[PDB]
């Protein structure tokens with residue numbers, strides 16, 4: 001795999017989103033990976049519905065948090081609508097998938113990266129954007145403005161984001177806190193530190209959808 005990957009440069013990442021007060025990061029992360037794999041497999045970059053996963057993923061908890069793996073499973077089982085069809089409202093309501101017509105895209109499954117393994121995560125990122133989790137509770141991460149982020153942070157993961165690239169000493173992360181956070185909504189997180197957890201626990205739990 002090459003020294004640099006940046007799925008934004010290949011057109012596989014939609015604009016940075018803002019989840020608002022809702023604890024929906026897990027759905028935003030999952031959607032980033034779906035938009036990416038659909039672009040990679042089909043050539044078309046579309047936006048898909050975070051709101052649909054928020055309402056309909058019965059294994060998650062709406063705005064009280066959730067699981068990127070469960071959302072990617074939901075997309076592999078049923079499907080997902082375009083964002084325009086099922087736009088983000090920032091609050092869990094009722095599942096409306098059956099009232100919004102046929103799904104827009106569908107994947108075929110969910111593979112997990114092997115945790116606590118930098119190269120395994122770099123490998124997946126080399127093939128597609130990947131849903132990852134990290135500790136976002138720290139102030140240093142919350143106030144990040146730019147540069148290669150080294151922490152300080154622990155490995156108490158609490159926040160789902162998406163890895164969309166990497167370089168010799170970082171992994172490139174799309175956050176869902178709006179375009180005003182970090183480097184236009186992205187963070188470059190140091191890698192290669194030899195800590196198995198990764199900076200901010202970045203290697204704890206990383207998933208990607210499979211689409212043939």
Ligand SMILES: *[C@@H](C(=O)O)[C@H](O)C(=O)N[C@H](C(=O)NCCCCCCCCN)C1CCC1
Nearest residue numbers: 023024025026061065066133157158159160
């Ligand atoms: C992420 C965010 O910052 O918005 C959000 O907190 C999240 O989903 N985190 C997530 C998680 O903790 N999920 C499961 C716990 C929620 C249990 C609630 C039970 C309430 C029952 N009514 C994981 C993936 C990122 C860390």
